[PDB]
Ligand binder design. Structure first.
Ligand SMILES: Nc1ncnc2c1ncn2[C@@H]1O[C@H](COP(=O)(O)OP(=O)(O)O)[C@@H](O)[C@H]1O
Ligand SMILES: Nc1ncnc2c1ncn2[C@@H]1O[C@H](COP(=O)(O)OP(=O)(O)O)[C@@H](O)[C@H]1O
Ligand SMILES: Nc1ncnc2c1ncn2[C@@H]1O[C@H](COP(=O)(O)OP(=O)(O)O)[C@@H](O)[C@H]1O
Ligand SMILES: Nc1ncnc2c1ncn2[C@@H]1O[C@H](COP(=O)(O)OP(=O)(O)O)[C@@H](O)[C@H]1O
Ligand SMILES: [Ca+2]
Ligand SMILES: [Ca+2]
Ligand SMILES: [Ca+2]
Ligand SMILES: [Ca+2]
Ligand SMILES: [Ca+2]
Ligand SMILES: [Ca+2]
Ligand SMILES: [Ca+2]
Ligand SMILES: [Ca+2]
Ligand SMILES: [Ca+2]
Ligand SMILES: [Ca+2]
Ligand SMILES: [Mg+2]
Ligand SMILES: [Mg+2]
Ligand SMILES: [Mg+2]
Ligand SMILES: [Mg+2]
Lengths: 380, 380, 380, 380
């Protein structure tokens, strides 16, 4: 049975066409998403959550957001390499390599580790071996990036059936290929990137009409906003700068994202990090305990919300379209669950956005739809 | 652009996937159906209505219902040949041949004439040349009959894409491939044949579960019922037996079917055949003028309506199904328009039958759907 | 406990339908017809086909096209009163009355009579008395005219569940509500009116962008074009002016419409009116018998076709839309069956019209769907 | 002029939703939550989360699960009255009252209070006061219980447009009404009840073939299984019986539910209750801190899973159906999010459940659709 795979910059999702319906599969960690993170520690290499859970402690051996480099040449990525803590070096071909303890990997090899783990754990969950997949890529990827992604799947031991666009995969998952003439604005906000795509769906041609976005705007920026708030409140209370202790900083990142997620369903939550630091005078343990209201959370992220408007406006103008001429706005990415993002979408386009399908599963589901179709299997 | 073609035993229909929607095309005679009739007269051969309009006058050179012979061996068809007025002879292979004035044609060659005329007139209507088609056949046809039909299309100059089942084509045209799990009873009543098919639509497999029918039950039997009524009423009034004059009989067949069709939309109609015969005593012209009520029409056809039940009951039993277990009954064939047939269907299965699509166009539309799909074109 | 129905109260014909087994079914009347002429005649009182069959004979006791005056004040339909053979006088209020032999009636009372026959005859097909209905009205009707139509239903003995637009009930029958956002041009040509409606179906609503049309362009005008031709050709061949005889004119009108309906599906038909007039010199009977081809029919109705351009170009201009910006064109009204009309749409809009559903039943079918859904029924 | 809403009045939680832009939107309450606990507490009067957060502290002024008594007579719920901490006395009629500090209330009045908060808080998201609603009830409710639920809405100040079955509103949200005939098993597991419903959606109706379930099997029982484990482990490690302290028991209940929700998407979570009790010898504080794995969670809740077999096998037997004869199994209720539950369905029915829509919002979403359609709105 063929599967769909969302090779995302932050998380990856696998799904399979089961009985005409896409089903997302759990990983070994019991989670429907696998972080796109590989950790090279002194021992067995870590891939997934266990890698992301130690990324602050192991900056030299943890490779994250490798998707920003896959398929590009170094002269084009010099700046983004200055923004990463791991070593990014050019290859014999002008390519990109990651150097850990002197060893050298390609972004296709790093990506292939994430893909292999997804297929391994999914094959266990399904009780059959998975060898054929459809992998998705951002609409703005070129042939080099599409082939490099296809290579990453082959290296992981997969027969790659097709490399399709993420926004198309989303439209497939929402079934907008079955509603005649649709003009779809895909509003993709994920871990680190923001992506606006305008699709002219009609007579079966998914014609991309405009792209825009923000390559450094995502849910992790909301996370850091909480982190800086929590550390400032702790320096003021105890004179301890938790951002200087990699162990305390790693728990702040972990606790911040958890509180943000809880605040997508409720008005107030409490961050509690016991034994976070030692009191400088008495050397006794210190426990962080703060309550974050959604109201404060939204004040902290407002500059991120205000930057959503630009890409949306530019994509409309680049396509010659009015908010009124958009026939459907679909929400993609785990970060569109923030109620404030949803309101921002309403205010930007004057329409109620489709939120039927899980936003962090919609790509993987559409990709699995494509897969089953290429293999004869149908939909409902 | 690929087309669908219903090579029917009485009429043939052509249709094309236009803008995601099947459109049936008119022939040279401005009619959405072309009779499956070829006439070999002393001159240019007649194919279509002009052939059917002279079939009583030219019994030796008019070939009708050739579909009953296509792809079968003579030893299997000896009896049906005794039922036709034209010569049916075996070939060097045990096949079937039609002999007109000593010349010899195959049912594939006769059929190819009907198909060629359909493509010729349709190519004029569309302004582009038509070379690729999907042709349909009864579900009970074997490989010999499917290949012979495919041959008839190739002989007509067509690239045959696929030979699919008529009931599947109907289900396609009704869109029942887009309603998950459907158990469909196809109720096909056409010119001369009655066909009941049970389709297990589910997960994309159109599994035929049962077939039954009546190879000599159709709309022409209703026509003859009117004819015998009109001739008896005319013998009683004038001592003239209009069935003995091929010219008067040809007008009775033509006028009978027209009155039947009018009585599908209204309660009463008038058959008026002026100058039909000469008065035996005075040699002056005689004019037939009778009014047929739908009530009388239904009395005349009741034995045809009562024979509908058998095949339906046998197909349910052959499939192990109850009327309640049928998920949908679709009406196929120009003859299911008779309000009495529709009531008979309600009473047989206890369900309201789907009559959305034109019953004499539903096959050709589904076939054109199949065609466009094999060629990438989509639906709405 | 009873089944609610939908009713198209049209200017020329009225149609009733119900939703049986999730299926929209148009019901026949006592005369076995799926359309009931919107005509009332006082001779006994006549309502429907019988009233239409003697409309030329009884020019002042026959009320027809009452929909032009319903809900309107006399001071605004004064010029339309001068165009009808029956008496139209203002009431004590600014309203509109029709005077027949001193007896006064209102547009509501006249309409209510058409409705009562529909419910009475339909109640006998279903086996139970219909009490609730959904009645349709032109999109351009005001609240006064919508109030009046609902009143005519209450007089008839109906509970009016809702008064919805005819262009909306058409899109319902065609399922456009299940295709996200669709821009739809509704091409409505009936017995005597031409109506163009542009809809944007989406965001929960049927947004009317533009309305256009011709109040005196319809299928009846094509009828008169055939009548005038037959009358002149008989003038030319026998020196008798049939249009001066109410008995012959009545037969011509009846026959012209039938020839038209036949020339929708065939290239040639024959009009036969035996004993239509007497020779002025010989006092001997004369029989009309003329064959009419579609080509002649289409040359007689050509001036009528030329008037279809204007309203379509005005609504597009009134909406800011291009024929390419129309997603779907649906065909409504008995006149849209004429092939020359469908061709005119093809040329004005560049796309093939939707004729999947009977143009004279599609509106009543939507209203049937709107009644079932308000009664907790759903479409199968 | 206003927007009508749909409301799930559930045994444990209540959900409100509306149909904005043809889209079903669940609305948050004043506490920013998409579910409002069906609890009322008199201390001031408390309704919702605040009433649930002090339910262990105020055992006799807190009314919960009032849906067990609504519409029912006292002589029939006598044994269910003995199972609750608050007073349940018979009224002057055979009805049911709850006595709190001498003050009497009815199930309708208690329910009406839950409803009033939903409409009040939702009216502030929409900007207009909601006056019309569609409220859902279990398929097994009688007219008395359906009457009572509508009365509770009228007390709340609502016009009850209709009282529809929860299993029908679920199929609406899942669009099963647009798939011809579907046999659907609705697996409903909520806070405290288990409900199995077999539907045959077709022929215009939602035919209930079988109803089954467990009145005391739900998500709350999984909560108590976690509470009892924490209480015994604390007994074992500190010799303090937290279940004897209403203040600690209240915190345990609150924390056990949160750990459960986290173990729906992860393999391991930690419960942390600082300052939960005092040492009996030292009078020094004690902090609970236990990590709970899904595997332990799934072993604690295993007896609850075993009880899911019975009702499913009884409804299949009560319908004459085979797991293979079920076309679709849809997942409803907050408890169906537990992975062990979805696995149990996979095994009992042999097919993957539909979890495309949030199991705790799907019913309110259908009711939202049923309100928009009765108000002339349609789904985008
Ligand atoms: N319920 C939620 N509420 C708010 N943010 C969420 C929620 N779930 C996930 N996110 C955030 O969304 C992001 C994950 O989105 P995803 O589509 O998986 O990323 P990517 O496409 O960048 O690989 C993370 O920043 C995560 O914190
Ligand atoms: N409106 C109608 N009412 C009744 N019978 C009709 C009507 N239209 C066509 N028929 C009859 O239906 C038959 C044509 O059906 P068709 O499906 O074209 O035939 P076949 O499948 O046998 O080639 C003829 O007997 C014709 O008289
Ligand atoms: N099959 C047909 N072919 C041609 N014209 C037709 C056909 N059926 C109906 N018409 C014409 O359409 C008109 C009736 O249209 P209809 O929708 O019933 O009217 P209205 O909506 O104006 O009340 C008549 O003039 C009739 O002659
Ligand atoms: N994500 C989740 N994971 C696990 N259990 C959950 C989740 N969400 C809700 N539940 C549980 O489901 C129950 C609520 O279900 P719900 O449908 O709201 O209740 P009801 O229909 O009985 O009023 C609670 O016991 C809650 O703990
Ligand atoms: Ca399925
Ligand atoms: Ca659309
Ligand atoms: Ca628009
Ligand atoms: Ca559009
Ligand atoms: Ca839309
Ligand atoms: Ca189209
Ligand atoms: Ca189905
Ligand atoms: Ca059934
Ligand atoms: Ca079934
Ligand atoms: Ca059905
Ligand atoms: Mg993503
Ligand atoms: Mg046929
Ligand atoms: Mg009309
Ligand atoms: Mg519930």
């Amino acid at each position: 049975k063929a599967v769909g795979i969302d090779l995302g910059t932050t998380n990856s999702v696998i799904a399979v066409l089961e009985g005409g319906k896409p089903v997302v599969l759990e990983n070994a960690e019991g989670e429907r998403v696998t972080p796109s993170v590989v950790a090279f520690r002194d021992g067995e290499t870590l891939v997934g959550r266990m890698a992301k859970r130690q990324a602050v402690l192991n900056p030299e051996g943890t490779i994250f957001e490798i998707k920003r480099f896959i398929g590009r040449r170094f002269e084009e990525v010099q700046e983004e390499a200055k923004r990463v803590p791991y070593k990014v070096v050019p290859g014999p071909d002008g390519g990109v390599r990651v150097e850990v303890k002197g060893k050298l990997y390609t972004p296709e090899e790093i990506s292939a580790m994430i893909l292999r783990k997804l297929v391994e754990d999914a094959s266990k969950k399904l009780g059959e071996k998975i060898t054929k997949a459809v992998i998705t890529v951002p609409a703005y990827f070129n042939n080099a990036q599409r082939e490099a992604t296809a290579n990453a799947g082959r290296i992981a031991g997969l027969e790659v059936l097709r490399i399709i666009n993420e926004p198309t995969a989303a439209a497939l998952a929402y079934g907008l290929d079955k509603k005649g003439n649709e003009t779809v604005l895909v509003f993709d906000l994920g871990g680190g990137t923001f992506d606006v795509t305008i699709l002219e769906i009609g007579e079966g041609v998914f014609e991309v009409k405009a792209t825009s976005g923000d390559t450094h705007l995502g849910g992790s920026d909301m996370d850091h906003a909480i982190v800086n708030w929590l550390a400032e409140e702790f320096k003021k209370e105890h004179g301890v700068d938790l951002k200087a202790d990699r162990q305390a900083l790693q728990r702040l990142i972990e606790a911040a994202e958890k509180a943000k997620i809880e605040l997508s369903s409720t008005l107030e939550t409490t961050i509690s990090l016991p034994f976070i630091a030692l009191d400088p005078a008495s050397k006794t343990p210190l426990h962080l305990e703060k309550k974050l209201t959604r109201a404060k959370f939204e004040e902290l992220i407002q500059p991120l919300l205000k930057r959503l408007r630009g890409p949306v406006e530019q994509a409309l103008k680049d396509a010659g379209l009015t908010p009124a001429q958009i026939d459907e706005v679909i929400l993609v990415g785990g970060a569109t669950r923030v109620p404030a993002v949803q309101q921002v979408v309403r205010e930007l386009l004057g329409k109620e956005p489709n939120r039927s399908v899980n936003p962090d599963e919609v790509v993987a589901m559409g990709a699995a739809i494509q897969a089953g179709v290429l293999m004869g299997e149908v939909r409902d």
